[PDB]
Design a protein around this ligand. Sequence first.
Ligand code: CLA
Ligand code: CLA
Ligand code: CLA
Ligand code: CLA
Ligand SMILES: CC1=C(/C=C/C(C)=C/C=C/C(C)=C/C=C/C=C(C)/C=C/C=C(C)/C=C/C2=C(C)CCCC2(C)C)C(C)(C)CCC1
Ligand SMILES: CC1=C(/C=C/C(C)=C/C=C/C(C)=C/C=C/C=C(C)/C=C/C=C(C)/C=C/C2=C(C)CCCC2(C)C)C(C)(C)CCC1
Ligand SMILES: CCCCCCCCCCCCO[C@@H]1O[C@H](CO)[C@@H](O[C@H]2O[C@H](CO)[C@@H](O)[C@H](O)[C@H]2O)[C@H](O)[C@H]1O
Ligand SMILES: CCCCCCCS[C@@H]1O[C@H](CO)[C@@H](O)[C@H](O)[C@H]1O
Lengths: 121, 51
Amino acid sequence: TLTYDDIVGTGLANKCPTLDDTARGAYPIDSSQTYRIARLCLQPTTFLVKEEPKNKRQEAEFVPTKLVTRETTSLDQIQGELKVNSDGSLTFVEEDGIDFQPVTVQMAGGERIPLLFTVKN
Amino acid sequence: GLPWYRVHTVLINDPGRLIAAHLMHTALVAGWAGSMALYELATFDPSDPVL
Ligand code: CLA
Ligand code: CLA
Ligand code: CLA
Ligand code: CLA
Ligand SMILES: CC1=C(/C=C/C(C)=C/C=C/C(C)=C/C=C/C=C(C)/C=C/C=C(C)/C=C/C2=C(C)CCCC2(C)C)C(C)(C)CCC1
Ligand SMILES: CC1=C(/C=C/C(C)=C/C=C/C(C)=C/C=C/C=C(C)/C=C/C=C(C)/C=C/C2=C(C)CCCC2(C)C)C(C)(C)CCC1
Ligand SMILES: CCCCCCCCCCCCO[C@@H]1O[C@H](CO)[C@@H](O[C@H]2O[C@H](CO)[C@@H](O)[C@H](O)[C@H]2O)[C@H](O)[C@H]1O
Ligand SMILES: CCCCCCCS[C@@H]1O[C@H](CO)[C@@H](O)[C@H](O)[C@H]1O
């Protein structure tokens, strides 16, 4: 466990926690109890933007972009109910958290594309 | 004195100033190439090599 001072300025504050190769187990769901996601974190590694060509009949592709707003893109500290359904599916219902980031990326040639990268609600 | 259409004949017996005039010509042509390319880049739409 690193402290703030270990981390400040490294870029690690924008990275989600990882797990070891060894974590290939199974977390039991006991339909008797209630559950929560206490922390959800999402860390974008790629932003693609769909091109808008001059005619349909060309399937438009998603293309790579360049991030210009730095290491400010991650969603985190998100929490909420983890429901157990009749059919044993689970449903996450987001309640709160740092669940959005404005982001600007740039297309080849310079066009800037701001977006509100989010999982709100 | 020299007619207007002969002014550059001063260079015929002056190798150093001939080289200088050549260099200037060369500077003008290379500067043109540079300027031309920038104007083209400032106006070129790269978004459709098809049509
Ligand atoms: C490659 C081009 C070039 C070079 C290297 C030379 C070099 C020379 N000239 Mg020649 N000359 C040129 C082109 C050139 N000239 C042109 C186009 C004209 C017609 C205007 C002349 C008319 C001329 C005269 C009347 C004389 C020379 C003379 C000479 C010598 C002394 C320098 C001088 O007085 O220049 C004078 C010439 C200029 C300063 C050219 C004027 C600049 C023009 C109008 C372009 C403007 C440039 C500007 C930055 C861009 C405008 C953009 C636009 C959108 C408005 C030297 C051998 C002198 C001498 O040695 O005679 C024995 C002399 O009396 N030249
Ligand atoms: C590499 C090519 C080249 C070179 C280095 C020369 C060099 C020379 N020429 Mg020749 N000439 C050429 C090609 C060339 N010429 C061509 C293609 C023609 C047919 C168009 C001629 C027809 C010609 C005549 C009829 C005469 C010369 C003369 C001369 C001498 C004096 C030039 C002068 O003072 O003009 C001074 C010129 C000005 C002050 C202004 C000229 C402005 C022009 C007309 C329009 C604007 C030009 C513009 C800047 C062009 C740049 C574009 C580029 C692509 C050409 C000099 C030795 C003279 C000579 O023999 O003296 C003894 C002479 O009477 N030339
Ligand atoms: C090793 C011997 C040598 C070499 C390598 C050259 C090469 C050259 N000469 Mg020639 N020349 C020579 C011997 C040589 N010359 C001798 C012994 C004489 C009798 C004195 C001449 C008389 C002569 C005349 C009258 C002219 C040339 C010109 C040229 C140039 C024409 C192409 C140009 O401008 O491209 C474009 C240029 C480049 C792409 C840049 C190249 C990098 C440069 C050369 C580095 C500069 C540093 C260097 C230390 C300076 C001395 C260079 C000098 C050896 C050429 C070119 C650089 C013409 C000229 O210079 O036009 C502008 C020209 O008018 N020469
Ligand atoms: C192979 C390629 C080539 C060659 C052989 C030349 C040769 C010449 N150039 Mg250079 N030039 C070139 C490529 C070339 N150019 C390129 C790519 C550029 C960048 C645009 C230039 C830009 C340039 C400038 C700015 C100048 C030259 C000049 C010259 C002349 C210098 C020697 C002289 O005194 O002639 C004496 C002049 C003549 C014999 C008359 C040439 C007439 C041409 C061929 C026809 C154009 C005339 C027409 C009436 C002009 C209308 C233009 C108007 C609408 C604005 C010579 C004829 C200089 C010159 O003309 O100085 C007076 C000059 O100022 N050139
Ligand atoms: C000094 C210096 C520098 C800078 C430089 C520069 C910036 C330059 C520029 C240059 C340029 C920018 C140039 C330009 C040129 C141009 C030209 C030379 C043009 C010409 C034209 C003509 C000749 C035309 C003709 C005509 C007409 C007009 C019409 C139609 C017909 C015809 C085509 C005939 C640096 C920093 C690098 C460093 C070293 C020092
Ligand atoms: C060493 C020194 C110095 C130096 C200086 C110099 C060397 C300068 C240069 C100068 C120069 C040498 C300049 C130039 C000019 C140029 C011009 C004036 C040009 C014009 C052009 C044009 C006008 C163009 C047009 C066009 C074309 C051609 C094509 C494309 C289109 C367009 C239209 C864009 C000083 C003093 C700083 C001081 C310190 C020391
Ligand atoms: C060495 C000498 C000094 C160097 C200066 C000369 C460089 C000139 C050419 C470089 C190419 C860039 O050229 C320039 O690009 C931008 C972005 O596409 C364009 O800019 C234009 O489109 C963009 C859309 O993305 C708008 O944000 C902008 O308000 C508009 O004017 C210009 O119309 C173009 O002229
Ligand atoms: C001599 C230095 C040249 C200065 C270079 C300008 C940046 S490069 C420039 O960038 C624009 C916007 O991204 C592009 O649209 C354009 O196509 C490209 O030429």
